[PDB]
Amino acid sequence: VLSEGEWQLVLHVWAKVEADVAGHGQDILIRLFKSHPETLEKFDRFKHLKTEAEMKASEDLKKHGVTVLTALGAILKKKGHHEAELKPLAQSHATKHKIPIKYLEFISEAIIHVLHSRHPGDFGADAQGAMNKALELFRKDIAAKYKELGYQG
Ligand code: HEM
């Protein structure tokens, strides 16, 4: 599992993300969309935005970045005991949104990059390793639920 010490590192960085969720979630989604254009085609509501400027300008995109980080936050503060939060998310993303497990790996890279941009002194190699472990556990448990449903990535 993650140690209690690695959970400390994780949550101490997330409490700073919580100071500007809407700004963090907007950077993250933007980085996802640009590095991996195919993910944007998953979103009928966003599929019109072609440039970075248009993305930055959208209130609705910012609303959805708040949705995602809040749900991730709920999960991270359960330190592993996240079965009840995670189960509905796997079901919707499997059966309704149809999101490949690989795209969950892409947004995981985006979160880590943005956390490093916005919080260097605070997000050293050690906190980087703890956060990547916590995201892998997230991916790992959703992937198990996908397999059960017949979607396995
Ligand atoms: C940490 C990653 C993610 C979290 C915590 C997360 C969380 C959520 C939540 C809470 C919702 C709204 C309720 C739901 O539909 O069940 C949602 C909706 C959605 N998510 Fe995810 N999501 C994540 C990653 C992704 C990725 C990587 C994609 C696409 C590449 C994606 C695409 C969508 C779409 C299409 C919706 C619905 C948007 C709309 O209202 O039309 N999600 N997600």
Curated annotation (Swiss-Prot):
Its main location: cytoplasm. One of its GO terms (molecular function) is peroxidase activity. Its EC number is 1.7.-.-, 1.11.1.-. GO terms for biological process: removal of superoxide radicals. It is an enzyme of class 1 (oxidoreductase). The modification Phosphoserine is found at residue 3. It comes from the Eukaryota. Heme b binds at residue 93. Nitrite binds at residue 64. It catalyses: Fe(III)-heme b-[protein] + nitric oxide + H2O = Fe(II)-heme b-[protein] + nitrite + 2 H(+); H2O2 + AH2 = A + 2 H2O. O2 binds at residue 64. One of its GO terms (cellular component) is sarcoplasm. Residues 1-147 form the Globin domain. Monomeric. Monomeric heme protein which primary function is to store oxygen and facilitate its diffusion within muscle tissues. Reversibly binds oxygen through a pentacoordinated heme iron and enables its timely and efficient release as needed during periods of heightened demand. Depending on the oxidative conditions of tissues and cells, and in addition to its ability to bind oxygen, it also has a nitrite reductase activity whereby it regulates the production of bioactive nitric oxide. This is Myoglobin. It comes from Physeter macrocephalus.
